[PDB]
Design a protein around this ligand. Structure first.
Ligand SMILES: CC(C)CCC[C@@H](C)[C@H]1CC[C@H]2[C@@H]3CC=C4C[C@@H](O)CC[C@]4(C)[C@H]3CC[C@]12C
Ligand SMILES: CC(C)CCC[C@@H](C)[C@H]1CC[C@H]2[C@@H]3CC=C4C[C@@H](O)CC[C@]4(C)[C@H]3CC[C@]12C
Ligand SMILES: N#Cc1c(N)nc(SCc2ncc[nH]2)c(C#N)c1-c1ccccc1
Ligand SMILES: N#Cc1c(N)nc(SCc2ncc[nH]2)c(C#N)c1-c1ccccc1
Ligand SMILES: CCCCCCCC/C=C\CCCCCCCC(=O)O
Ligand SMILES: CCCCCCCC/C=C\CCCCCCCC(=O)O
Ligand SMILES: CCCCCCCC/C=C\CCCCCCCC(=O)O
Ligand SMILES: CCCCCCCC/C=C\CCCCCCCC(=O)O
Ligand SMILES: CCCCCCCC/C=C\CCCCCCCC(=O)O
Ligand SMILES: CCCCCCCC/C=C\CCCCCCCC(=O)O
Ligand code: NA
Ligand code: NA
Lengths: 381, 381
């Protein structure tokens, strides 16, 4: 049984190292968005809300975690504030991650109405609502769902606490049924599962749109071959009618549709050879115009998929960092006779959850050019 | 390719956290030995030499590691000093660990001559020799075994280095054949293997001595039973002669040997019943005296085994922390075409080796009462 200040010196130093990084990296995220007008869009306002939560993890949650780990004497409700504040930040993070996923789904599924649906001032209103909701969720124990009515009086007397005070220990004041059913299952697990569903729908929408672009491109080229190897005017007409509906479906295009109409008129006059010659002109338009549109549309979809993968990595890292702590609480709660969860593992799980506040600035720097470039310029300046 | 200052900010913060802990813990080790005269013995003078090396890891090696990781412009030999200084500390640690193992072997194998062989002033002389040898081993590259004759001129010109300067990078100035054959195989691996051999001999010596104590105890009790179930004076004499040689072998004992002689005289006179009655008196002496010696001797051996296990854990942790770095160097050296050792893994291996400077104060606190108690009193004061 080595002096408690030794093992806790490792814990405290690790916590403070994480706080330094959480503050530095996320201040840099906010700074980049403030300076670069190319980074000022709705998606990045939620990115700023998420970085603000991570800055408060370093400034407030980590000092609070170090404090409550001592078990210092405190009035139960004051204790309950420094125990639960991290839950407010985690909840705010969940709401920002969920909003980012929904923003990306609107952008890929209905890009025509994105600008009119997703407004900068509406994003600020959603963020405000989400922060107020997060306070209500994270601080629900202070509203009455707590163990303040059944204080551990033996622990309070041992530590020489005053009347009306308890030894401030997280597990003594925050109910385990709140942590597992309310915080984990309802407020963390359900939103993360919803996020997963949204990301699946984003990638499936992108996969289908790319297939539809290639399907229309193939239909155009295949029907040109059908016209070349046709012997009757009815066969030329059949392929041209299918090409015309496909050209409007994919909507340079004025020349294309006009040239299809020119050949269709010749086909209807029974001039097969003349219709096939008119259809050959379509190849020049396809090369000079249509292929450029196809390649630009494909490149736009790939950029959207790349941005959605970056956002999903951010969400995936939140799940990876927070799940161990939640899972440990599930074992403590659901298996009361399980000899499990040593204190070193509980501190490792807490340290891992705090680590999530360090990782997002790295993901933006490694995956997003505009962020990476702005970070270089801020470090230079 | 995120800005280099970001990933290196994680590395630097982790290195500085380790330096804080290496200094704090090992200052506490030195403080305890200085204050408590129960901790002032030869074994703990080597413990202080090992803690002094760990304090210099925090004060000098870690700031040097951070510095050379930038690749700053430097005169090749100056570069070679801040590259190799950590090797001096690692070598000094190896010598202290080896001395601690040899000290414990002398204590268990020849406890009668330990005080006369192992002197405090001789320990200070060995430590002095070991530190001078460590400087020669660790700084052998500065004596000429270096890549200063073949500077990477393209790297020096790129960084705008002056004439006579190189980009200070460990792998550019310290030869890989020095690191693998000389530093690893000869100066690290051979001494660690020697340490393992010494620890095996310590535990085998302890195991044999405990078996010899129980063998003499069993021989005493079994021969008492032989005397009780004897019918002739020759049988009583045979068991008493074996008991007498065993009593001197285990050397209260004056009473025991005298009572054996009393019964032996009766046996030689052909007085069987009288000899068996005289031998029954041995039981009172065995209970009042001999069993107390047996239990104290057994308890002393168990304390020595416990102390040797603690010292072996210290050595085992050095091997566990330093081996990954050495093994990575072996892959780089022996397999030049092996696409291996990413830079994040090289930093993880360096961070793990530095971590070894933090762990020893914890092992003493968790395993050694006199250290643990002194640490409490230093923290109280
Ligand atoms: C994607 C979702 C479903 C993953 C979230 C993790 C949850 C639902 C799972 C994963 C492992 C599960 C635990 C596995 C082991 C036990 C021990 C048993 O005595 C009580 C239930 C308990 C404690 C389970 C509770 C629920 C649990 C924590
Ligand atoms: C107890 C002692 C023997 C353990 C010390 C580790 C040393 C001797 C061993 C363990 C794993 C070994 C390495 C395993 C793989 C390779 C790849 C091969 O292409 C070159 C040799 C090399 C690089 C070996 C060199 C020696 C090595 C590093
Ligand atoms: N779940 C849980 C939990 C806990 N069971 N304990 C503590 S603090 C005392 C402690 N740390 C290690 C051992 N004992 C904390 C804190 N902060 C938490 C916690 C909860 C949510 C978010 C972040 C952390
Ligand atoms: N072996 C090796 C080694 C190395 N190959 N490089 C570096 S420093 C640049 C670096 N760190 C990460 C990537 N690149 C260092 C240092 N210090 C060492 C080293 C050697 C002995 C002891 C402790 C560390
Ligand atoms: C603490 C919260 C600070 C974070 C909010 C400031 C960022 C402003 C912005 O980038 O638009
Ligand atoms: C919603 C805000 C309601 C105020 C809750 C007070 C909590 C309390 O006093 O226990
Ligand atoms: C990074 C890993 C170090 C994890 C820090 C937590 C150490 C806690 C030690 C303890 O108090 O039991
Ligand atoms: C830096 C090296 C300092 C360590 C040596 C001082 C300890 C003295 C002692 O405990 O005997
Ligand atoms: C042994 C000491 C010898 C001095 C070595 C000098 C090293 C050098 O100048 O390269
Ligand atoms: C503790 C684990 C953290 C390890 C610190 C090293 C991070 C290095 C990052 C890098 O520069 O590639
Ligand atoms: Na967060
Ligand atoms: Na060391």
């Amino acid at each position: 049984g080595a002096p408690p200040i030794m093992g806790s010196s490792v814990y405290i130093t690790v916590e403070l190292a994480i706080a330094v990084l959480a503050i530095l990296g996320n201040v840099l995220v906010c700074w980049a968005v403030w300076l670069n007008s190319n980074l000022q869009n709705v998606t990045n306002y939620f990115v700023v809300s998420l970085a603000a939560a991570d800055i408060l993890v370093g400034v407030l949650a980590i000092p609070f975690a170090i404090t409550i780990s001592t078990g210092f004497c405190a009035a139960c409700h004051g204790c309950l504030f420094i125990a639960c504040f991290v839950l407010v930040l985690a909840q705010s993070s969940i709401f920002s991650l969920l909003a980012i996923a929904i923003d990306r789904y609107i952008a890929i599924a209905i890009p025509l109405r994105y600008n009119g649906l997703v407004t900068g001032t509406r994003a600020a209103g959603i963020i405000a609502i989400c922060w107020v909701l997060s306070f209500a969720i994270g601080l629900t124990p202070m509203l009455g769902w707590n163990n303040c009515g059944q204080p551990k009086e033996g622990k309070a007397h041992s530590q020489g606490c005053g009347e009306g005070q308890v030894a401030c220990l997280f597990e003594d004041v925050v109910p385990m049924n709140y942590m597992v059913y309310f915080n984990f299952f309802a407020c963390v697990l359900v939103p993360l599962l919803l996020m997963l569903g949204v990301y699946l729908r984003i990638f499936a929408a992108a996969r289908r749109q790319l297939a539809d672009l290639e399907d229309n491109w193939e239909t155009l080229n295949d029907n040109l071959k059908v016209i070349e190897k046709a012997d009757n005017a009815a066969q030329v007409k059949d392929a041209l009618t299918k090409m015309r509906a496909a050209a409007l479906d994919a909507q340079g295009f004025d020349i294309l549709v006009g040239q299809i109409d020119d050949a269709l008129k010749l086909a209807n006059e029974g001039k097969v050879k003349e219709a096939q010659a008119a259809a050959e002109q379509l190849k020049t338009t396809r090369n000079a115009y249509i292929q450029k549109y196809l390649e630009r549309a494909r490149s736009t979809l790939q950029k959207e998929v790349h941005a959605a993968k970056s956002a999903a990595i951010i969400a995936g890292l939140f799940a990876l960092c927070w799940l161990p702590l939640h899972i440990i609480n599930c074992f403590t709660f659901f298996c009361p006779d399980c000899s499990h969860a040593p204190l070193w593992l509980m501190y490792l799980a807490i340290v891992l959850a705090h680590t999530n506040s360090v990782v997002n600035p790295f993901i933006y720097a490694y995956r997003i050019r505009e962020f990476r470039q702005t970070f270089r310029k801020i470090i230079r300046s």
